[PDB]
Design a protein around this ligand. Structure first.
Ligand SMILES: [Zn+2]
Length: 96
């Protein structure tokens, strides 16, 4: 489940970030101009212990000062079945 206060990142099929909201920028402590175009998993420092193909029901703890945040992933799929992209949802751990 997603909330209004969550960070959101969306990518193309190759995992490059195309959309990121201001809350995600706040949580990551980055500027948009330094995020767009780059690989999501790399931006999140999950580069090794995870890859796109594998996106699962599990939430994960993200290193962030700042916070920790918990993140869950999903795929963007067409009717043809084809995965056209990916979404990360970043939750403040003290959400509630
Ligand atoms: Zn949330």
């Amino acid at each position: 489940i997603t909330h209004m206060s969550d960070g959101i990142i969306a990518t193309d099929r190759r995992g490059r970030i195309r959309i990121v909201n201001d809350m995600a920028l706040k949580m990551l402590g980055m500027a948009k101009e330094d995020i767009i175009g780059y690989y999501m998993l790399s931006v999140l420092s999950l580069e090794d212990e995870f890859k796109l193909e594998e996106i699962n029901n599990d939430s994960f703890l993200l290193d962030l000062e700042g916070l920790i945040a918990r993140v869950n992933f999903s795929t963007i799929v067409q009717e043809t079945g084809f995965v056209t992209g990916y979404i990360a949802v970043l939750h403040d751990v003290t959400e509630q």
